[PDB]
Amino acid sequence: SRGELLLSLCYNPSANSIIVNIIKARNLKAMDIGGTSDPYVKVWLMYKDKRVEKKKTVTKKRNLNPIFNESFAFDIPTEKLRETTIIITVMDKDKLSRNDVIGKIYLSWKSGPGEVKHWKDMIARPRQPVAQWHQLKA
Ligand SMILES: [Ca+2]
Ligand SMILES: [Ca+2]
Ligand SMILES: [Ca+2]
Ligand SMILES: [Ca+2]
């Protein structure tokens, strides 16, 4: 159990855009020896197996329940929706080694049940932000 992340998705087909809001996380795994992590969240837009664009939040120091409230806009033509995946990875920044992966969420029509439900809800509710909590998976 790696933690959970609360995020919203808002897709506007007329503008060919999605807004991904990384809201907050809870109960993150501690990936530093003293019982904390320094979390930031990266958001990768994929088209088929290609990386299109990457965005990331600030880093919160020594915080297993960070609150971000950061909003990221991506261009996504309606014609590319079926081939789109949004991969969200919560990371632990480290000074003296490679940053550690806390966990990931994959958003598309071909992911886990909660993820697919959130994606379909976004599609069904154009221009409405839809927020859900997801379990982070290693
Ligand atoms: Ca670490
Ligand atoms: Ca760290
Ligand atoms: Ca490390
Ligand atoms: Ca590093």
Numbering used by the authors: 266 to 403
Question: Would you copy out the relevant sentences from the publication that reported this structure?
Answer:
Members from the synaptotagmin family form a hierarchy of Ca2+ sensors and are believed to underlie at least in part the distinct Ca2+ dependencies of different forms of regulated secretion. Functional differentiation among synaptotagmins is expected to arise primarily from differences in the properties of the two C2 domains that form most of their cytoplasmic regions (referred to as C2A and C2B domains). In this context, the C2 domains of synaptotagmin-1 have been the subjects of particularly extensive study. Both domains form characteristic β-sandwich structures that bind three or two Ca2+ ions (C2A or C2B, respectively) through loops located at the top of the β-sandwich, and do not undergo substantial conformational changes upon Ca2+ binding. The relation between the functions of synaptotagmins-1 and-7 is particularly fascinating, as data obtained in chromaffin cells suggest that these two isoforms play at least partially redundant roles, and yet synaptotagmin-7 does not function as a Ca2+ sensor for synaptic vesicle exocytosis despite being enriched in synapses.
The r.m.s. deviation between 713 common atoms of the synaptotagmins-7 and -1 C2B domain is 0.71 Å, which is comparable to differences observed between structures of a given protein in different crystal forms. We observed three Ca2+ ions bound at the cup shape formed by the top loops of the synaptotagmin-7 C2B domain (loops 1–3). The three Ca2+ ions bound at the cavity formed by the top loops are coordinated by five aspartate and one serine side chains, as well as by three backbone carbonyl groups (the Ca2+-binding sites are numbered 1–3 as is common for C2 domains). Note that this serine residue of loop 3 is not generally conserved in synaptotagmin C2B domains and hence binding of the third Ca2+ ion is an unusual feature of the synaptotagmin-7 C2B domain compared to other isoforms. We also observed a fourth Ca2+ ion bound outside of this region, but this site is not common in C2 domains and the Ca2+ ion is coordinated by only three protein ligands, suggesting that occupation of this site is due to the high Ca2+ concentration present in the crystallization conditions (20 mM) and is not physiologically relevant.
